[PDB]
Structure 1
Amino acid sequence: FLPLVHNVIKCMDKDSPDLHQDLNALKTKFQELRKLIGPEQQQQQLHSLREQVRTKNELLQKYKSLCM
């Protein structure tokens, strides 16, 4: 999250020299990014899907040899 670090750096550099106060802009941008962005459950689901796809491919290839 480079935005929070950049906001903290700007607030620390502009503590005494408050020429351009972008604290509100940074907070609004952070809130908007958090609203727009939206555990290992996804990884487990992906592993299960990969295993199921491998099983389906194996089952499809099991019916390759067929004479009559």
Structure 2
Amino acid sequence: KLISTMPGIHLSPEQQQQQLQSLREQVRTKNELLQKYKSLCMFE
């Protein structure tokens, strides 16, 4: 029981996985936005 609780996830893993997927999507969106911003650099 101690080894099982040692994992860290107190709440059920359903909402944990939902939040992890949301964070992964947000990270992908942020990376794509940063790439699109740093790519289109044609001003002077």
The residue aligned with 1:57 is: 31
Segments ≥4 residues shifted beyond 4 Å = none
What TM-score do you get using the length of structure 2 for normalisation?
0.64
Root-mean-square deviation (Å)? 2.2
User: Could you say which structure has the larger radius of gyration?
Assistant: 1
Structure 1 segments unaligned to the other structure (5+ residues)? 1-29
- Between the aligned residues of both structures, percent identity stands at 67
* Aligned length in residues: 36
What TM-score do you get using the length of structure 1 for normalisation?
0.44
The residue aligned with 2:20 is: 46
